Amino acid sequence: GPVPSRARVYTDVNTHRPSEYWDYESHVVEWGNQDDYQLVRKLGRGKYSEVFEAINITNNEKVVVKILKPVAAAKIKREIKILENLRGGPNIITLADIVKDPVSRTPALVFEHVNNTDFKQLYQTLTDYDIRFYMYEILKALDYCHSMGIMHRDVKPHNVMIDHEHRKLRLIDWGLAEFYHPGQEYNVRVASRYFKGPELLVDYQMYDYSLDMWSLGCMLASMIFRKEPFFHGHDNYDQLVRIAKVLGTEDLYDYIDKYNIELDPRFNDILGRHSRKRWERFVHSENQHLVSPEALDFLDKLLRYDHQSRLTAREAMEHPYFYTVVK
């Protein structure tokens, strides 16, 4: 069957920790007071939660209240434990409180409010310097969570709140996040279609932090080439075909060979044969200002089929693409 794989960094971070750190099921929640928060307006709804803008009446500060639905069940404890483990980390959303919602009867997470500018309006209007600056800020969050033994598993533009006026960024929505344990097989039904790594698309379960680096690569490609999204699949199968039209089929078949993966036979009639395209094929008069040799070299090292071959978050922070960003 498939050959096993391990992360090449932060491999055994959880194994050395007391079970209290990663055994989220045994965690005991410290409940705050629901009366401290007044709901102001509904912001949105996910498949597992409802999100509201609210006011913390004990300091008149704006907050966000995420009311979890029952569908989460046992997974609610995992999100709370991850948020508490990561609290204070660079560019990680701050969990301010956990209260019991009176109406729902399920847990409500209270977060610091970020005055965000919508990604459809924003991440496609940034200058070359701002793409580099915000990417560097997202990498600080990813290196922190990976160093803490956690994979986000849902990196995408909707999950990055940016206050552009204040040049501040937060990585949010830790509801799919998981603790990395070497040798563990994980669910491949994570991340959003356009940001799913090839390991998810070929049903390889022993993935790691490097999944977040593929998703980050997809975001970078969309910003530098001004294409939303970069890999525009119609479903999870066509998603892999879209990737193969760019990266080629030979390196895809080499990846499947290396990990001894059984590729779903439905790919035999749709993948075709493709060669890797040079990154300059995606450059045009509208996006040429955002493209440099350093941006293309960086993107090339994130968008690799072999998850073990992608840059780690710390290696990405060392890349020349970021030499122009004030540190």
Ligand X SMILES: CO/N=C1/NC(=O)C(Cc2ccc3ncccc3c2)=[SH]1
Which of 110, 114, 148, 150 lies at the binding interface for ligand X (CB under 6 A)? 114
| CB hemisphere CA count around 175 (13 angstroms) | 20
Q: According to the annotation, is 196 in a ligand binding site?
A: no
Give the whole-angstrom CA distance, residue 128 versus residue 122: 13
Are the CB atoms for 186 and 205 separated by under 8 Å?
Answer: yes
User: Which residue in 14, 49, 56, 239 binds ligand X (CB under 6 A)?
Assistant: 49
Locate tokens 């969570």: which residue? 145
Residue from the set 32, 46, 90, 248 that interacts with ligand X by CB under 6 A: 46
Partners of residue 42 on adjacent β-strands = 52
**Angle at CA of residue 27, ends 24 and 30, nearest 5°:** 130
Identify the active-site residue in 97, 154, 173, 208.
154
Minimum CB distance to ligand X smaller for 116 or for 287: 116
Among 7, 54, 64, 219, binds ligand X (CB under 6 A): 64
Q: Which is nearer to ligand X, 66 or 81 (CB)?
A: 66
Residues 168-207, mask of contacts with ligand X (x by CB under 6 A): ----xxx---------------------------------
297 is catalytic: no
Q: How many residues bind ligand X (CB under 6 A)?
A: 16
Residues 214, 142: Cα–Cα separation, whole Å: 12
- Contact string 86-105 vs ligand X (x = CB under 6 A): -------x------------
Q: Which CB atom, from 177 or from 296, has the smaller least distance to ligand X?
A: 177
Q: How far is the CB of 286 from ligand X (least distance, A)?
A: 30
- Residue of 313, 198, 207 whose CA lies nearest to 251: 198
Residue with tokens 């060669």: 275
Nearer to ligand X, 71 or 270 (CB): 71
Q: How far is the CB of 205 from ligand X (least distance, A)?
A: 25
Q: Which is nearer to ligand X, 66 or 226 (CB)?
A: 66
Examine residue 116 and tell whether it contacts ligand X (CB under 6 A): yes
The residues near 245 (Cβ < 8 Å, ≥ 6 apart) are 274, 277
The CA-to-CA distance between both ends of the chain, in Å, stands at 46
**Strand pairing category for 168-171 and 178-179:** unpaired
The interface region with ligand X, picked from 107-115, 203-211, 248-256, 262-270 by CB under 6 A, is 107-115
Determine whether the annotation assigns residue 61 to a binding site. Answer: no
44 belongs to an annotated ligand binding site:
yes
* Contact positions with ligand X (CB under 6 A) in 150-169: 161
- Taking CA atoms, 66 is separated from 27, 73, 81, 297, in Å, by 20, 15, 15, 39
CA distance 190 to 67: 21
Q: Which residues pair with 163 in a beta bridge?
A: 168
Chain positions contacting ligand X, by CB under 6 A? 43-44, 46, 49, 51, 64, 66, 93, 111, 113-114, 116, 161, 172-174
Residues labelled as active-site residues: 154
